[PDB]
Amino acid sequence: GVALGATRVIYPAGQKQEQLAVTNNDENSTYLIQSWVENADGVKDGRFIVTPPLFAMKGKKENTLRILDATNNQLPQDRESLFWMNVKAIPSMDKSKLTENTLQLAIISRIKLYYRPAKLALPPDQAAEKLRFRRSANSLTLINPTPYYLTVTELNAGTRVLENALVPPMGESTVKLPSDAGSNITYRTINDYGALTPKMTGVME
């Protein structure tokens, strides 16, 4: 819920500030966008700040967020970094001035944000071609123990078609797989421009 400029956002050596639009589907309801960024842990750490981080707008409008460098914290270079760019978007946050703490109204849009100064020696086109896969009679583990982080969208594994997933940092994720799943894997990915790729082949081992 809420129609932000994208469903996924990238900071390719943003080295100033980037942007993310906000719009709505409905045109009656007003919204209160309340961005915060999180250290992949869902802890809100001001390693990123947003500007305006906090606004109301009328739902059918645009109001862009800009998202700017507040890291400076000795981020790694032997691997990259991943953020969650959470937005509580309340369709008008009335009934939150000391009236209990149980206002359900919160379309938390929960977006993901990549960081990459891209100063790793890993060739970023091949990042998706060294994301390994391990198939089982229940699961398909995504294997991103690589330093770079790329998205895998619409994973096809043998005789089955699977969900979108996101990459954990230098680690493995899992999606559902049947007790059939042939030895072909293919997928689309999100490259650093937000370019959802053509159908590309994929790399189990």
Curated annotation (Swiss-Prot):
* Keyword Chaperone annotated: yes
Keywords from the named record: Chaperone, Fimbrium biogenesis, Immunoglobulin domain, Periplasm, Signal
UniProt record, GO biological process: cell wall organization; chaperone-mediated protein folding
Cellular component GO terms held in the UniProt record: outer membrane-bounded periplasmic space
User: Gene3D superfamilies from the xrefs?
Assistant: Immunoglobulins (2.60.40.10)
The subcellular location is: Periplasm
- Identification of the protein by name: Chaperone protein FimC
This chain's source organism reads Escherichia coli (strain K12)
> Organism classification, top ranks?
Bacteria, Pseudomonadati, Pseudomonadota, Gammaproteobacteria, Enterobacterales
Q: Could you tell me the gene encoding this protein? A: fimC
